[PDB]
């Protein structure tokens, strides 16, 4: 828990103790400096539709929305950890929401031929994250700056769920992903917390729906996707899909995730290096770790954090961080060899994450 | 009350008894036929951005928004009068909202140089009517088709009121009109009825405000406009401004309108033709009726209806209707000599109007 493992910046015990100490660790602070410090090129420099930070990291366009959202989710926990950083966190979330609305972020929807308006129908990965971000911004800050937009988007989501014959909303037309839906549903919980409404009531029918052909309940794993026109499910189970989904669902129905979590571990998690490390296979019938989009281990790090699983957290971060060669130069964090897309975002988020339930319960400013 | 006056289609008693009888008068039915009957050219033929009906009547572009809105207000009362026409009224209100959103309607905002977006700030005449319409549509139908938009617009209005140093919102930049505000405030009352919220709380400060430099208490009349940047109030009192404002306010604070109504009548209303007729002077210091925009008598007809003043309603309609030479041809109403802009719209509305308070209390479908 408390010896510093090789190549690590801080102990697992230290990450887990941040909220009790009311202080982020020095490496988290260095990450926040990376996020905020340098003129023009830091990701949270300004509200403008500029993306230099992402150009410098070679972020693919389609990934930008995810990078901003994951930063935002980590920032909401920063606000909870240290009151003296709450205003900074709020500021950064204001930027995140601003940037999220820039066409460089959502414009794939139009370029791919699916519509000129990214909100009106479908496209739940985008608009689900946006809706969750509106809510987290407001929980952190108390500001109604985006409330009119939040009330609108929450209602578009609710209406589209009510109009669909399946529980939830697609991304591209005819592509249903459980992980993208999980973010949309959690957004309804956040709106409800802020407004006293009951949009979250739709969650029960959703949790029932995803436990049919979308899940292998013995392995504790979701299938890749569902396709409402045919009723097909793509017949491979996905670790990153599962880890993300269980993490968010644990803030809505903790028992659901508690049920599947040990099975999920047995299905996908490989402990290695004499128990010191772990890495995650993306699908069944392979020994290879981190196949597919390459995010199984990083999303499992987030899940371990959400579930309070310090041992697995430690093992995963020992696999992920040391080979990426962190350094802190002028009190700012950089990685020489990030091992995946969304690397600094997901390691940030996992180091700070207070639990989705705790974010829902965030006290007022 | 019950003898039919020369040139009239129905008695004042008949208009006032429609709700008790659960039936519109035959001439009101004929007006609804003008509104709905003929392919392509009737105003309520379809939801499209087509405006042939208004082209045929030579409606000026700037007036379209008012024509649609006044139709909508009348349709809400039709819904209340006759349950068997409630679905038709709901249908027409759906069309009215759809048309109201067409750039032909709101595009003067952009052409005049004020902005490309007619909702985001200012422009309360447009967006106040739109918001009231969204609410009336939902009271009539129970449909949430526009709720996401209604939730957004209501919050833009509320936010703009909170941010302003005067109570309310401008139309064009630096032009404040009490009548346009009255519609926006009533829209909040309707949103509250539907949602259980308290946006209407802002109404008290507004009623306090307008009873300062904007009202002449000796005459029970509002001044034409207020101009926040200079603090100027245009120094002429306006009958049509007053009549419209007192009518809408009577649904929010009936005592306020009751306080001013006898003064307003003494200031502007000329009874003539041995007590049979009445006509309304637009401003002080003149004997001429219906100067300015030419709508004093027609908005006073609405006010008389709202206040339950059968005698004045009868007098005004005796002045307005007979010279316009109504006829009903193939069960549809037409006027050979409409005496003003918005003529059929306002005579429709006054004939059916059940009271703004009664509309707020409309029972569910």
PDB file of C-alpha atoms in Angstrom, chain B residues 137-280:
ATOM      1  CA  UNK B 137     -49.443  24.145 -26.976  1.00  0.00           C
ATOM      2  CA  UNK B 138     -48.511  21.880 -24.067  1.00  0.00           C
ATOM      3  CA  UNK B 139     -51.463  22.902 -21.869  1.00  0.00           C
ATOM      4  CA  UNK B 140     -53.836  22.160 -24.755  1.00  0.00           C
ATOM      5  CA  UNK B 141     -52.326  18.870 -25.956  1.00  0.00           C
ATOM      6  CA  UNK B 142     -50.350  17.346 -23.117  1.00  0.00           C
ATOM      7  CA  UNK B 143     -47.584  16.768 -25.708  1.00  0.00           C
ATOM      8  CA  UNK B 144     -43.870  17.238 -24.844  1.00  0.00           C
ATOM      9  CA  UNK B 145     -42.934  17.715 -28.449  1.00  0.00           C
ATOM     10  CA  UNK B 146     -41.513  21.210 -27.701  1.00  0.00           C
ATOM     11  CA  UNK B 147     -40.679  20.785 -23.994  1.00  0.00           C
ATOM     12  CA  UNK B 148     -36.902  20.649 -24.492  1.00  0.00           C
ATOM     13  CA  UNK B 149     -37.133  24.005 -26.367  1.00  0.00           C
ATOM     14  CA  UNK B 150     -39.589  25.433 -23.802  1.00  0.00           C
ATOM     15  CA  UNK B 151     -37.235  24.531 -20.931  1.00  0.00           C
ATOM     16  CA  UNK B 152     -34.344  26.228 -22.705  1.00  0.00           C
ATOM     17  CA  UNK B 153     -36.183  29.418 -23.693  1.00  0.00           C
ATOM     18  CA  UNK B 154     -37.777  29.853 -20.312  1.00  0.00           C
ATOM     19  CA  UNK B 155     -34.336  29.741 -18.714  1.00  0.00           C
ATOM     20  CA  UNK B 156     -32.842  32.215 -21.226  1.00  0.00           C
ATOM     21  CA  UNK B 157     -35.707  34.610 -20.312  1.00  0.00           C
ATOM     22  CA  UNK B 158     -35.339  34.099 -16.591  1.00  0.00           C
ATOM     23  CA  UNK B 159     -31.543  34.577 -16.795  1.00  0.00           C
ATOM     24  CA  UNK B 160     -31.836  37.769 -18.806  1.00  0.00           C
ATOM     25  CA  UNK B 161     -34.356  39.222 -16.391  1.00  0.00           C
ATOM     26  CA  UNK B 162     -31.975  38.364 -13.478  1.00  0.00           C
ATOM     27  CA  UNK B 163     -28.989  39.962 -15.200  1.00  0.00           C
ATOM     28  CA  UNK B 164     -30.729  43.272 -16.085  1.00  0.00           C
ATOM     29  CA  UNK B 165     -30.643  46.348 -13.857  1.00  0.00           C
ATOM     30  CA  UNK B 166     -34.242  47.201 -14.838  1.00  0.00           C
ATOM     31  CA  UNK B 167     -37.069  44.586 -14.437  1.00  0.00           C
ATOM     32  CA  UNK B 168     -37.528  42.807 -17.781  1.00  0.00           C
ATOM     33  CA  UNK B 169     -35.981  42.477 -21.182  1.00  0.00           C
ATOM     34  CA  UNK B 170     -35.655  44.718 -24.247  1.00  0.00           C
ATOM     35  CA  UNK B 171     -36.872  44.169 -27.797  1.00  0.00           C
ATOM     36  CA  UNK B 172     -34.463  45.883 -30.136  1.00  0.00           C
ATOM     37  CA  UNK B 173     -31.361  46.896 -28.159  1.00  0.00           C
ATOM     38  CA  UNK B 174     -32.217  49.767 -25.874  1.00  0.00           C
ATOM     39  CA  UNK B 175     -36.043  49.604 -26.613  1.00  0.00           C
ATOM     40  CA  UNK B 176     -38.136  48.486 -23.602  1.00  0.00           C
ATOM     41  CA  UNK B 177     -41.894  47.935 -24.125  1.00  0.00           C
ATOM     42  CA  UNK B 178     -44.171  46.998 -21.259  1.00  0.00           C
ATOM     43  CA  UNK B 179     -46.600  45.088 -23.490  1.00  0.00           C
ATOM     44  CA  UNK B 180     -43.820  42.818 -24.869  1.00  0.00           C
ATOM     45  CA  UNK B 181     -42.646  42.153 -21.332  1.00  0.00           C
ATOM     46  CA  UNK B 182     -46.159  41.305 -20.218  1.00  0.00           C
ATOM     47  CA  UNK B 183     -46.223  38.388 -22.668  1.00  0.00           C
ATOM     48  CA  UNK B 184     -42.789  37.099 -21.438  1.00  0.00           C
ATOM     49  CA  UNK B 185     -43.890  37.194 -17.825  1.00  0.00           C
ATOM     50  CA  UNK B 186     -47.125  35.392 -18.587  1.00  0.00           C
ATOM     51  CA  UNK B 187     -45.031  32.739 -20.361  1.00  0.00           C
ATOM     52  CA  UNK B 188     -43.283  32.075 -17.047  1.00  0.00           C
ATOM     53  CA  UNK B 189     -46.624  31.542 -15.308  1.00  0.00           C
ATOM     54  CA  UNK B 190     -47.546  28.983 -17.965  1.00  0.00           C
ATOM     55  CA  UNK B 191     -44.171  27.190 -17.624  1.00  0.00           C
ATOM     56  CA  UNK B 192     -44.734  27.058 -13.873  1.00  0.00           C
ATOM     57  CA  UNK B 193     -48.165  25.629 -14.206  1.00  0.00           C
ATOM     58  CA  UNK B 194     -46.849  22.877 -16.401  1.00  0.00           C
ATOM     59  CA  UNK B 195     -43.604  22.169 -14.383  1.00  0.00           C
ATOM     60  CA  UNK B 196     -44.216  23.127 -10.746  1.00  0.00           C
ATOM     61  CA  UNK B 197     -41.427  25.692 -10.800  1.00  0.00           C
ATOM     62  CA  UNK B 198     -41.358  29.344  -9.576  1.00  0.00           C
ATOM     63  CA  UNK B 199     -40.064  31.364 -12.518  1.00  0.00           C
ATOM     64  CA  UNK B 200     -43.161  33.561 -11.999  1.00  0.00           C
ATOM     65  CA  UNK B 201     -41.671  34.963  -8.759  1.00  0.00           C
ATOM     66  CA  UNK B 202     -39.929  37.647 -10.816  1.00  0.00           C
ATOM     67  CA  UNK B 203     -43.411  39.146 -11.658  1.00  0.00           C
ATOM     68  CA  UNK B 204     -43.679  41.209  -8.441  1.00  0.00           C
ATOM     69  CA  UNK B 205     -40.530  43.231  -9.071  1.00  0.00           C
ATOM     70  CA  UNK B 206     -41.692  43.809 -12.661  1.00  0.00           C
ATOM     71  CA  UNK B 207     -45.132  45.105 -11.596  1.00  0.00           C
ATOM     72  CA  UNK B 208     -43.369  47.427  -9.100  1.00  0.00           C
ATOM     73  CA  UNK B 209     -41.063  48.719 -11.777  1.00  0.00           C
ATOM     74  CA  UNK B 210     -43.664  49.475 -14.441  1.00  0.00           C
ATOM     75  CA  UNK B 211     -45.676  51.493 -11.942  1.00  0.00           C
ATOM     76  CA  UNK B 212     -42.792  54.091 -11.748  1.00  0.00           C
ATOM     77  CA  UNK B 213     -41.835  56.301 -14.732  1.00  0.00           C
ATOM     78  CA  UNK B 214     -43.532  53.985 -17.167  1.00  0.00           C
ATOM     79  CA  UNK B 215     -47.132  54.649 -15.881  1.00  0.00           C
ATOM     80  CA  UNK B 216     -49.204  57.822 -15.560  1.00  0.00           C
ATOM     81  CA  UNK B 217     -51.368  57.159 -12.555  1.00  0.00           C
ATOM     82  CA  UNK B 218     -53.796  60.040 -13.266  1.00  0.00           C
ATOM     83  CA  UNK B 219     -54.639  58.420 -16.557  1.00  0.00           C
ATOM     84  CA  UNK B 220     -54.150  54.620 -15.860  1.00  0.00           C
ATOM     85  CA  UNK B 221     -51.901  54.513 -18.894  1.00  0.00           C
ATOM     86  CA  UNK B 222     -48.434  53.427 -19.822  1.00  0.00           C
ATOM     87  CA  UNK B 223     -45.958  55.459 -21.731  1.00  0.00           C
ATOM     88  CA  UNK B 224     -44.927  54.244 -25.131  1.00  0.00           C
ATOM     89  CA  UNK B 225     -41.433  52.939 -24.292  1.00  0.00           C
ATOM     90  CA  UNK B 226     -38.400  53.144 -22.045  1.00  0.00           C
ATOM     91  CA  UNK B 227     -34.811  53.378 -23.212  1.00  0.00           C
ATOM     92  CA  UNK B 228     -32.342  52.153 -20.572  1.00  0.00           C
ATOM     93  CA  UNK B 229     -29.111  53.621 -22.032  1.00  0.00           C
ATOM     94  CA  UNK B 230     -30.461  57.234 -21.885  1.00  0.00           C
ATOM     95  CA  UNK B 231     -33.089  56.612 -19.188  1.00  0.00           C
ATOM     96  CA  UNK B 232     -35.609  58.285 -21.504  1.00  0.00           C
ATOM     97  CA  UNK B 233     -39.280  57.461 -21.522  1.00  0.00           C
ATOM     98  CA  UNK B 234     -41.025  58.514 -24.688  1.00  0.00           C
ATOM     99  CA  UNK B 235     -43.422  61.089 -23.313  1.00  0.00           C
ATOM    100  CA  UNK B 236     -46.695  59.947 -24.964  1.00  0.00           C
ATOM    101  CA  UNK B 237     -49.177  57.576 -23.361  1.00  0.00           C
ATOM    102  CA  UNK B 238     -50.431  54.703 -25.539  1.00  0.00           C
ATOM    103  CA  UNK B 239     -53.888  53.050 -25.463  1.00  0.00           C
ATOM    104  CA  UNK B 240     -53.011  49.915 -27.377  1.00  0.00           C
ATOM    105  CA  UNK B 241     -49.901  49.468 -25.175  1.00  0.00           C
ATOM    106  CA  UNK B 242     -52.026  49.838 -22.090  1.00  0.00           C
ATOM    107  CA  UNK B 243     -54.904  47.687 -23.177  1.00  0.00           C
ATOM    108  CA  UNK B 244     -52.688  44.771 -24.154  1.00  0.00           C
ATOM    109  CA  UNK B 245     -50.582  45.072 -20.973  1.00  0.00           C
ATOM    110  CA  UNK B 246     -53.596  45.277 -18.628  1.00  0.00           C
ATOM    111  CA  UNK B 247     -55.182  42.279 -20.339  1.00  0.00           C
ATOM    112  CA  UNK B 248     -52.201  40.023 -19.859  1.00  0.00           C
ATOM    113  CA  UNK B 249     -51.443  41.300 -16.398  1.00  0.00           C
ATOM    114  CA  UNK B 250     -55.010  40.524 -15.319  1.00  0.00           C
ATOM    115  CA  UNK B 251     -54.140  36.824 -15.590  1.00  0.00           C
ATOM    116  CA  UNK B 252     -51.187  37.288 -13.205  1.00  0.00           C
ATOM    117  CA  UNK B 253     -52.296  40.011 -10.772  1.00  0.00           C
ATOM    118  CA  UNK B 254     -56.011  40.752 -11.322  1.00  0.00           C
ATOM    119  CA  UNK B 255     -55.967  43.534  -8.760  1.00  0.00           C
ATOM    120  CA  UNK B 256     -53.356  45.512 -10.768  1.00  0.00           C
ATOM    121  CA  UNK B 257     -55.561  45.631 -13.874  1.00  0.00           C
ATOM    122  CA  UNK B 258     -58.672  46.257 -11.844  1.00  0.00           C
ATOM    123  CA  UNK B 259     -56.904  49.298 -10.259  1.00  0.00           C
ATOM    124  CA  UNK B 260     -56.218  50.996 -13.591  1.00  0.00           C
ATOM    125  CA  UNK B 261     -59.114  49.862 -15.801  1.00  0.00           C
ATOM    126  CA  UNK B 262     -61.647  52.601 -14.974  1.00  0.00           C
ATOM    127  CA  UNK B 263     -58.952  55.270 -15.497  1.00  0.00           C
ATOM    128  CA  UNK B 264     -57.789  53.746 -18.734  1.00  0.00           C
ATOM    129  CA  UNK B 265     -61.415  53.896 -20.007  1.00  0.00           C
ATOM    130  CA  UNK B 266     -61.921  57.474 -18.978  1.00  0.00           C
ATOM    131  CA  UNK B 267     -58.634  58.504 -20.623  1.00  0.00           C
ATOM    132  CA  UNK B 268     -59.053  56.782 -24.003  1.00  0.00           C
ATOM    133  CA  UNK B 269     -62.514  55.407 -24.661  1.00  0.00           C
ATOM    134  CA  UNK B 270     -65.080  57.512 -26.594  1.00  0.00           C
ATOM    135  CA  UNK B 271     -68.665  56.192 -26.394  1.00  0.00           C
ATOM    136  CA  UNK B 272     -70.740  57.407 -29.327  1.00  0.00           C
ATOM    137  CA  UNK B 273     -73.899  56.661 -31.374  1.00  0.00           C
ATOM    138  CA  UNK B 274     -76.160  57.159 -28.370  1.00  0.00           C
ATOM    139  CA  UNK B 275     -74.302  54.611 -26.312  1.00  0.00           C
ATOM    140  CA  UNK B 276     -74.306  51.872 -28.912  1.00  0.00           C
ATOM    141  CA  UNK B 277     -70.698  52.168 -30.063  1.00  0.00           C
ATOM    142  CA  UNK B 278     -67.279  53.012 -28.704  1.00  0.00           C
ATOM    143  CA  UNK B 279     -63.890  53.824 -30.292  1.00  0.00           C
ATOM    144  CA  UNK B 280     -60.476  54.312 -28.638  1.00  0.00           C
TER     145      UNK B 280
END
